[PDB]
Amino acid sequence: TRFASVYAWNRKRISNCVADYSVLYNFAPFFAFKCYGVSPTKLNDLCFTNVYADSFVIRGNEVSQIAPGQTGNIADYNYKLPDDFTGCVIAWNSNKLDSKVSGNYNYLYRLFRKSKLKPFERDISTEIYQAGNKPCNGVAGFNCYFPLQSYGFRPTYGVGHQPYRVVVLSFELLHAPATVCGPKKSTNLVKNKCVNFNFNGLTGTGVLTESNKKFLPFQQFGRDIADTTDAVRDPQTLEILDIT
Amino acid sequence: SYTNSFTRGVYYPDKVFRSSVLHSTQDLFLPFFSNVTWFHNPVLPFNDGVYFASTEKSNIIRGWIFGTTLDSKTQSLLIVNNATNVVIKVCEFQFCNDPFMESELRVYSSANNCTFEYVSKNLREFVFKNIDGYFKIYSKHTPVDLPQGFSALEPLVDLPIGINITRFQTLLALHRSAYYVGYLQPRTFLLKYNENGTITDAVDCALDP
Numbered sequence A: 001t002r003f004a005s006v007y008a009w010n011r012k013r014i015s016n017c018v019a020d021y022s023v024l025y026n027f028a029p030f031f032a033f034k035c036y037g038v039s040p041t042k043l044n045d046l047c048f049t050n051v052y053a054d055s056f057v058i059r060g061n062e063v064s065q066i067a068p069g070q071t072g073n074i075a076d077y078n079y080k081l082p083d084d085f086t087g088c089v090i091a092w093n094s095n096k097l098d099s100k101v102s103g104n105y106n107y108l109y110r111l112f113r114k115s116k117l118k119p120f121e122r123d124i125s126t127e128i129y130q131a132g133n134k135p136c137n138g139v140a141g142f143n144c145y146f147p148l149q150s151y152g153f154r155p156t157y158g159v160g161h162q163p164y165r166v167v168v169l170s171f172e173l174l175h176a177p178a179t180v181c182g183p184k185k186s187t188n189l190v191k192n193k194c195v196n197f198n199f200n201g202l203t204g205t206g207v208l209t210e211s212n213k214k215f216l217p218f219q220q221f222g223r224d225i226a227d228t229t230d231a232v233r234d235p236q237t238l239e240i241l242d243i244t
Numbered sequence B: 001s002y003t004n005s006f007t008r009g010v011y012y013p014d015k016v017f018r019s020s021v022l023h024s025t026q027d028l029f030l031p032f033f034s035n036v037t038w039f040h041n042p043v044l045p046f047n048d049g050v051y052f053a054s055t056e057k058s059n060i061i062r063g064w065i066f067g068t069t070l071d072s073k074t075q076s077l078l079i080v081n082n083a084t085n086v087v088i089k090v091c092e093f094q095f096c097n098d099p100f101m102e103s104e105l106r107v108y109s110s111a112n113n114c115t116f117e118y119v120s121k122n123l124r125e126f127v128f129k130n131i132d133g134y135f136k137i138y139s140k141h142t143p144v145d146l147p148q149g150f151s152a153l154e155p156l157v158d159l160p161i162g163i164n165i166t167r168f169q170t171l172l173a174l175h176r177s178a179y180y181v182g183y184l185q186p187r188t189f190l191l192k193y194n195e196n197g198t199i200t201d202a203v204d205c206a207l208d209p
């Protein structure tokens, strides 16, 4: 319900799970959607250690600055992307949510800084920027400015001055063997018909029949002498079925 | 001191049911009639899996700690149990070199960069192994120096960590108000399966003629 400001952006780290990108891509609308390292279509066959999700609200005509190798008030002092980026940026409009008549003064951004930010660095300090050669010792005035401005969002703005919600996903492949990856399938189970079946990995053919054997409650399938699969356990209902 | 296992440290090599079938396997086992250390505690090696039994009606054995350096600068596992329940954890730690009202836990002093969390007489055997970034744990609890008998160990856990391991320890509950360590080698065994599918007997195929 509440996003973060640009100068202090959020960063949620996603653990080892199953990653469903078909909830955001199927969402239908969604503004800017540009993938860089991976292709937008096959996020469902590659997978990485951890994915990061950064969230903030910028202006409309500042969305072009969330891209590797760009410069501006946002790509220098607020949020920088490295030129070897391997995630993807997505952004949509939020005028009917983050904008109030009279002004929504709760979204800040920095516009004065000594040096450009480094990729994925965060700076939330509020010390007084000194533009001249004279010290000012912690009070604004001549040649000393408060570094944080603020968007006065109003609904009667033009596209380009209206609030846009940005989410940046970034993928990570350090060294881990098995990590957060994509998902799988389901299908109803039929019986008493020669069928082509695929039990969470077990691929086979045959007639399936209700069993009367009793596995131990950690065993998936049973084998015969001469080593052929002859029973399985249905993952969902957990019942044993013979395979003839 | 040192003691002699007799037929101990047999685990189900995997899922897949099975009945009366003297099935033959090649795997990492604890050889029959082995030389198991005795402890009444220090940093041990790992080098290839571990058998680990214990006994006590109270609960003095309160989990293990694993890893290569048992400190920061590299990652390690930590498996603990207060009087509540098990707490698996994987961070970079700073471990006491001797880590161990009812107030407790002088175990570590650091919990940085955690990459995995989890929270929630007697003879308690465990087999720990670590293959392809998975840390497998088999276990068995049989109630009454070890004794003599056969009891196969059933798989408990599976953790896709990726962690390197070269050393491990133990954790004990002090006094304020006995355990063994075998090692596993690549052997070939012949397991006898019951009609319900449990391993009732075995043969170590590299002992005598």
Ligand SMILES: *[C@@H]1O[C@H](CO)[C@@H](O[C@@H]2O[C@H](CO)[C@@H](O)[C@H](O)[C@H]2NC(C)=O)[C@H](O)[C@H]1NC(C)=O
Pocket (backbone or CB within 6 Å): A235, A236, A237, A238
């Ligand atoms: C997988 O999910 C299905 C539902 O999506 C679970 O099916 C439920 O099974 C219980 C039996 O204990 C029934 O009481 C429920 O009504 C079932 N739900 C539905 C929607 O049919 C199934 O149990 C799950 N798998 C496991 C292993 O629990």
Ligand SMILES: *[C@@H]1O[C@H](CO)[C@@H](O)[C@H](O)[C@H]1NC(C)=O
Pocket (backbone or CB within 6 Å): B002, B003, B004, B034, B035
């Ligand atoms: C175990 O090995 C040690 C190594 O010196 C030896 O002293 C001891 O006798 C051995 N124990 C048995 C039961 O063989």
Ligand SMILES: *[C@@H]1O[C@H](CO)[C@@H](O)[C@H](O)[C@H]1NC(C)=O
Pocket (backbone or CB within 6 Å): B080, B082, B084, B085, B087, B119
């Ligand atoms: C038991 O230890 C774990 C280790 O972090 C802790 O989270 C838990 O709170 C402890 N139990 C109680 C009752 O505090």
Ligand SMILES: *[C@@H]1O[C@H](CO)[C@@H](O)[C@H](O)[C@H]1NC(C)=O
Pocket (backbone or CB within 6 Å): B112, B113
């Ligand atoms: C691990 O912790 C150290 C010190 O807290 C930190 O410098 C390092 O960045 C952390 N690792 C990662 C991957 O962030």
Ligand SMILES: *[C@@H]1O[C@H](CO)[C@@H](O)[C@H](O)[C@H]1NC(C)=O
Pocket (backbone or CB within 6 Å): A175, B162, B163, B164
């Ligand atoms: C474990 O340590 C060895 C040291 O020989 C190293 O080569 C290996 O990369 C380490 N494991 C992982 C997963 O990095």
Ligand SMILES: *[C@@H]1O[C@H](CO)[C@@H](O)[C@H](O)[C@H]1NC(C)=O
Pocket (backbone or CB within 6 Å): B194, B195, B196
């Ligand atoms: C288990 O095995 C015993 C003996 O082999 C048998 O009598 C029993 O019917 C089997 N099944 C159980 C106990 O459910």
